[PDB]
Amino acid sequence: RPRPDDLEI
Amino acid sequence: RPRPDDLEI
Amino acid sequence: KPTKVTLVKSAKNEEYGLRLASHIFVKEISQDSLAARDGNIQEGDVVLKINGTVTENMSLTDAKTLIERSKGKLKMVVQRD
Amino acid sequence: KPTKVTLVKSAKNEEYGLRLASHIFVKEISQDSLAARDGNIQEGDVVLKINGTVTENMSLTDAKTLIERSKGKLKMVVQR
Numbered sequence: 001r002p003r004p005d006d007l008e009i
Numbered sequence: 010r011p012r013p014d015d016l017e018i
Numbered sequence: 019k020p021t022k023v024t025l026v027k028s029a030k031n032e033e034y035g036l037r038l039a040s041h042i043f044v045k046e047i048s049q050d051s052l053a054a055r056d057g058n059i060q061e062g063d064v065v066l067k068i069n070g071t072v073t074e075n076m077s078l079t080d081a082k083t084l085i086e087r088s089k090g091k092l093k094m095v096v097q098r099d
Numbered sequence: 100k101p102t103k104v105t106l107v108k109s110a111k112n113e114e115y116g117l118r119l120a121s122h123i124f125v126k127e128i129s130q131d132s133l134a135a136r137d138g139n140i141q142e143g144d145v146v147l148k149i150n151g152t153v154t155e156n157m158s159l160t161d162a163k164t165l166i167e168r169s170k171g172k173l174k175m176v177v178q179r
Contacts, residue, residue, distance in 0.1 A: 005075040006126060007038040007159045009166055009173075014156040015045065016078045016119040018085055018092070020147060023138045023175040034173055035132020038146065040121045040159055051116020058104040065119065066101055077158030078121050090108040092115055097101045 041065070042073045042081055044096065059096055067095035122146075123154050123162060125177065140177055148176040 025034050044063040053059050065073050068084050070093070076084070085092060106115050123146040128135050146154050149162060150169050157165075166173060 002037070002127075003039070003075055005159070007075075007123075007163055009034045009036050009038065009163075011046075011118075012120065012156055014078065016042075016082055018082075018115050018117050018119070020176050020178050021139055021144075023134075023140050023173075023177060025133050025137055025173040025175075027133065027171045032133065033129070035129035035134040036125065036140075037127040037129075038123055038159065038162065039126040040123050042119050042121050044117065045120040046118040048114065048116030048118075051114065052106050052108070053116040056104065056106060058102055059117070075159055077160070078119065078156055079158065081119065089111055092106045092108075094104045094106075095101050096104060 040075050040077075042068075042076065042078065043099065059094070060098065062099045063096040064099050065094060066097055067093075069093050121156050121158070123157065123159070140175070141179070144177040144179060146175060146177055148174075150174050 042065040044059055044061055047053050047061055068081060069088050071084055073081060125142055125144045128142055134140055148154060149165050152165055
């Protein structure tokens with residue numbers, strides 16, 4: 001579930 | 010193993 | 019057994035292609051503790067919520083303040099891992 | 100199926116008897132990305148270390164800072 005607070009690098 | 014920054018409550 | 023990974027970018031603005039997230043888990047239950055006698059929580063369980071708030075991507079430090087909010091009472095949602 | 104639990108203390112000095120830790124995991128890998136090509140890394144793996152620093156109990160915001168300290172290169176240790 002993609003969250004806004006996930007860390008995308 | 011135990012770590013200092015573990016959260017014990 | 020663990021695995022080493024080494025990723026090197028070909029340009030400044032290229033991404034790694036990695037979506038990282040964090041989960042809080044029950045690392046240890048003290049013998050004869052409140053949590054032990056209750057029976058519902060087990061070691062290894064992942065914590066989905068603390069006091070109505072979702073704990074995915076939440077720092078352990080922020081979870082501390084979230085627990086300290088409700089004195090004497092702790093509600094949680096856990097899930098076997 | 101997720102279970103609900105309510106623990107009630109009998110004194111503010113008493114403990115619940117719970118030790119908690121956080122683990123950073125690989126949630127999703129982008130199709131055909133650098134990680135999907137140049138890595139033996141899979142979705143669901145736990146991150147044990149980033150650039151030599153144990154990531155257990157590290158928040159995502161601190162991992163972000165640690166990842167950017169080495170612009171261009173990312174070293175990780177992961178586990179199934």
